[PDB]
Design a protein around this nucleic acid. Sequence first.
RNA 1: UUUACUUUGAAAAAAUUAGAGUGUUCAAAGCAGGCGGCUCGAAUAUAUUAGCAUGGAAUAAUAGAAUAGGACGU
RNA 2: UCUGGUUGAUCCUGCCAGUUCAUAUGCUUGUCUCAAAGAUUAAGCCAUGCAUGUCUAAGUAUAAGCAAUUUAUACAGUGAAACUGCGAAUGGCUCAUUAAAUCAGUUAUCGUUUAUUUGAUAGUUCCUUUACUACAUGGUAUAACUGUGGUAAUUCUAGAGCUAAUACAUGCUAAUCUCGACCCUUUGGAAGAGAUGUAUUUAUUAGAAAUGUCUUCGGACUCUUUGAUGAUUCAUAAUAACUUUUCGAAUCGCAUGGCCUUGUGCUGGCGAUGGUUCAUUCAAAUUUCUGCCCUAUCAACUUUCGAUGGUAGGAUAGUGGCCUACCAUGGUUUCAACGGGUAACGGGGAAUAAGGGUUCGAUUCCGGAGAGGGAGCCUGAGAAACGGCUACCACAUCCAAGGAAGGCAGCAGGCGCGCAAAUUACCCAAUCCUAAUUCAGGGAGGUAGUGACAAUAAAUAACGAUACAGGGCCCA
Lengths: 57, 244, 181, 170
Amino acid sequence: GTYRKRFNEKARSGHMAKLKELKRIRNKQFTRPNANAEILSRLKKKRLDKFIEHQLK
Amino acid sequence: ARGPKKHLKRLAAPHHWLLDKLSGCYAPRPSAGPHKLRESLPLIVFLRNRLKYALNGREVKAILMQRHVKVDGKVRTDTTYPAGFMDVITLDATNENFRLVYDVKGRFAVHRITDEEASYKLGKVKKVQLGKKGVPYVVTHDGRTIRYPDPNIKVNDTVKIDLASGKITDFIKFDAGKLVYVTGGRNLGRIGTIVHKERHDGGFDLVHIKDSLDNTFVTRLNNVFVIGEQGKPYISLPKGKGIK
Amino acid sequence: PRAPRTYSKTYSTPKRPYESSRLDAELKLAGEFGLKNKKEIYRISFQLSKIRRAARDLLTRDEKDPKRLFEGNALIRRLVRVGVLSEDKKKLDYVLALKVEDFLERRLQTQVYKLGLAKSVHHARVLITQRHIAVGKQIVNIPSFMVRLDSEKHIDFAPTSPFGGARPGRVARRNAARKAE
Amino acid sequence: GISRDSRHKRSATGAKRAQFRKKRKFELGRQPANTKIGAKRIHSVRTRGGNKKYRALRIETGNFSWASEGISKKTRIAGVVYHPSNNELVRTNTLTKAAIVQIDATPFRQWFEAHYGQTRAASAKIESSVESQFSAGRLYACISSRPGQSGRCDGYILEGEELAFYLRRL
RNA sequence: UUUACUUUGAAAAAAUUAGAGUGUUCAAAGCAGGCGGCUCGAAUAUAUUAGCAUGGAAUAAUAGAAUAGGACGU
RNA sequence: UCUGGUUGAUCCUGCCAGUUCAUAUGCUUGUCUCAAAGAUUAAGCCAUGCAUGUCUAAGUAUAAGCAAUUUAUACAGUGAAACUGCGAAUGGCUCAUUAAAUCAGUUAUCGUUUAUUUGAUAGUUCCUUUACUACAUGGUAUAACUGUGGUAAUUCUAGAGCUAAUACAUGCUAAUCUCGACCCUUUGGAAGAGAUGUAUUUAUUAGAAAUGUCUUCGGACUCUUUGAUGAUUCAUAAUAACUUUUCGAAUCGCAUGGCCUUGUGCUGGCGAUGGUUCAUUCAAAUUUCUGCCCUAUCAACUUUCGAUGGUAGGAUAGUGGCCUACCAUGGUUUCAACGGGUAACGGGGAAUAAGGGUUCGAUUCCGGAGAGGGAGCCUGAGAAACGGCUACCACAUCCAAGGAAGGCAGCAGGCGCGCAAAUUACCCAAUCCUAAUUCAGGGAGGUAGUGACAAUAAAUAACGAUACAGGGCCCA
Ligand SMILES: [Mg+2]
Ligand SMILES: [Mg+2]
Ligand SMILES: [Mg+2]
Ligand SMILES: [Mg+2]
Ligand SMILES: [Mg+2]
Ligand SMILES: [Mg+2]
Ligand SMILES: [Mg+2]
Ligand SMILES: [Mg+2]
Ligand SMILES: [Mg+2]
Ligand SMILES: [Mg+2]
Ligand SMILES: [Mg+2]
Ligand SMILES: [Mg+2]
Ligand SMILES: [Mg+2]
Ligand SMILES: [Mg+2]
Ligand SMILES: [Mg+2]
Ligand SMILES: [Mg+2]
Ligand SMILES: [Mg+2]
Ligand SMILES: [Mg+2]
Ligand SMILES: [Mg+2]
Ligand SMILES: [Mg+2]
Ligand SMILES: [Mg+2]
């Protein structure tokens, strides 16, 4: 349950940031201040590809 | 946790105390002291659940704040003070002296002793070492540091400590044929004579013990306490003499 | 929290409740001993099943086996004390021969009927629940109470009972007061 | 932000571990004290338990030992000449343990002259390299203390095989 | 010879499980002490694997300067 | 799993029909004992109240407090406020994350910190300005309090005046032991020659044929001289320096005994609190070996930005690539590495079963983790704390628009729907915990209330008399 859908993903954006970072390092093989400071669709285009090739033919 | 615990559930309490499971949610947690938590009897358990002089913890506190209870000759006012093996508990108003010894069941027995025997205790030598300024000392099983010990005293031996002065009167070497008392394991409370000490370097030493009925059993050396020569213990023994 | 308290079920439903032989047996038992429902029969059958299974397991063991001796002697002593097992049949083989009626005959209702304090098992049940029966010095209001051999000769009418030497109940003295008036 | 936990590292197989828990105070580290030669500046650090460490932020003196002569003298540190871990510590004149430094030879020379009456003769004989250094005015020393831990910059004078080794490395 | 394997012994919290005693009025439960020395009383047990100590003659691996050799030169 | 059919009658293979637990829900619901209370994978959001404080004779009272008194002469009974000290790191809740991680059993610290408890432990005589406080030092100082004030507003606070300590910061006061010539021969005297704490950092050092003579018949004559572990550069000791450098009682109650050369002389009892180091106890951090569900239509992975190891340093309480610099090119893997899924906290345990197995375990005990989400810290023996603080994300309350204040997965109690379910109850009496403390505090905990959770026992009737009639029941 590392990346399962959460009830309110917006309320825990900080947690979601870690998960994306964990995915990146885990899946990398497949791809290959101070607070405590005083001062702070495809079918249609494919179907279109069939007409124009037919019309050009 | 973020620091030391301060409570104890009744189910998590040492079994040998014989606490009722429905009496409450908590058991008396022994305070830091001469004996370890699991190997100790707090004064509340002794005064209320064994002797019945107090009907509840508040009366135990009332008894203790009158300064009626002495442990090894010194007044203790702490309700969960951890009394333990070989401790002498004195109640002057009742003219009573007790020594904490397990019975064959493995539980501390209510063992009454005389005023002459109340004057000393036995300590197993846990450590012999030089302190600062080159003064030797012995550490016993109850946490007593005793300086200038006899040079013959070694680890696993027993010393006889006079309570009034806290000095060694005599000692017994750990050797075959000595009378020993089992203070741990499933043979806790049994008495016998040492037959052989099986030694294993880097491991746990083992001791074979023969009882008066000629039954033999094996125990770790950590659970063995020398109490005298065979047929002549240094302390009065409870009923049964550690048989079975 | 505080430690759990143990509990258990004292009965179990039979394998096939709808067998005609079972229904007829239950009819005869409940009628002869004045039982309220089938659950009392199930309770007794559950106890007897536990006892006989224990005796079977002990008999499987070798004679002179320490466990066999210890537990078989305990079971035999308990069955003899409760009166189900006779003094002349102190063996596990006769423990396997026991039946539900042996336990039902030891109920206080049956004993109160048999000793002659009641005219039927139902009168006995009514007498027990109405606090008229004492076993020794103790009033027992439980019909399923199991009478021991020693307790058998101490069943009597209670000192507080109108049948035991006390004053009459409300009905008798109400009638007497109205008759006097 | 410094932690010494081993959970953030990869497993010995190479696996990426997941976060077990949030960082604990009992596994922390602190900023290094890059001790440098100058007027004494030391600040205490409250460490685990009530114990305290001393941070030498700056130091220019130390108790250095002549082991052959069995003596110790307090001396000024001139500078760092060699460091076996990192040359930038020599470039910036940062004092740590094992750094090779140059120390003023004056107190040792005075002790030698007082004790042997020489600038008896057999006992006064010392190594040629050490005497050449005494002629130079500075002695090569190795720091034996941890300045960022104890606040002290103690050390000893290089002699024998160690001195030959470090003379080669220089 | 060593290992595997197997025997025994420690170890494996308590509660829970099984078992013993006990007229909670019965029961589900809870519970450890009685009489004036009595040879009276939970006697207790339970856990596949891993580690520890230990007795083994088979079985399966593993080992041997096991039943070896003795002719020449300047 | 059994039972009845498919034949004129059997056997085998097929077909047909009937054969607890979990969730939701319907009706009924008198008595005794007992006991529980999750769930939208929503670890979603929360109005209000409470859940952590604490004082003995024994740290600090001229409260302009109260009350006493033989009516007060430094104080003295009792004592708000405030300082000081301790606790608030336990408990309670929840199961989000987490798949050799947690956890279970079994190891190690010869690898480290540890408030507190228990036991031990510290005469350093002298050393020039003696120009000398120890019959006892300072403000290098303040709170409460008095008084003058700002703000719409908060457990907000400013300026000014006071005054204490177990706060803070300073700083002192004729010893003991070795030999011992000489006498004297012991209960000996002593001319004299010598010696002298801890703590911190480093270097160095130690730590391995007297088989006789005499004698009083006893005894004396010369020599010995560290310990421990399987194992150490261990314990301990010694030398030389070193240190923004420690400690080595300027504290408190009760009481008024003993010596005299009679002085408010000297001495002296039972306690409290502190203090150096060691040991112990309560702990903590790390740590050795073995053991996890599904997935190979995941076969190579890790190493550029530490991956495996070496040397050195830094940091840590301390080992260690924990981090840094320089070096090697290693480490894991068909005995399944790595990656993916998990309606994955682990276990003790629960259910079922004849046995093997299989499922369940948020849930009374133990261990781990978290406090809406990431990150970082102060204090402290102990916290990466959340009923502590600071930022950012998301929500959200008050405002006079300038600002100010937030964290129920604690106990009650709400929202999350428009469709639904325990009391915003009483108490610290028991159990135990905390404190300076027998006494104060505790939604921890207990008491009672409230949907038939799971369980135990068990009422709703029993016994008679009389009258009338001839049919009642069982199989097929
Ligand atoms: Mg906790
Ligand atoms: Mg044992
Ligand atoms: Mg009545
Ligand atoms: Mg009633
Ligand atoms: Mg005090
Ligand atoms: Mg995974
Ligand atoms: Mg304390
Ligand atoms: Mg102490
Ligand atoms: Mg050493
Ligand atoms: Mg290193
Ligand atoms: Mg590097
Ligand atoms: Mg989950
Ligand atoms: Mg828990
Ligand atoms: Mg936490
Ligand atoms: Mg929430
Ligand atoms: Mg604190
Ligand atoms: Mg936090
Ligand atoms: Mg809260
Ligand atoms: Mg909290
Ligand atoms: Mg709530
Ligand atoms: Mg509660």
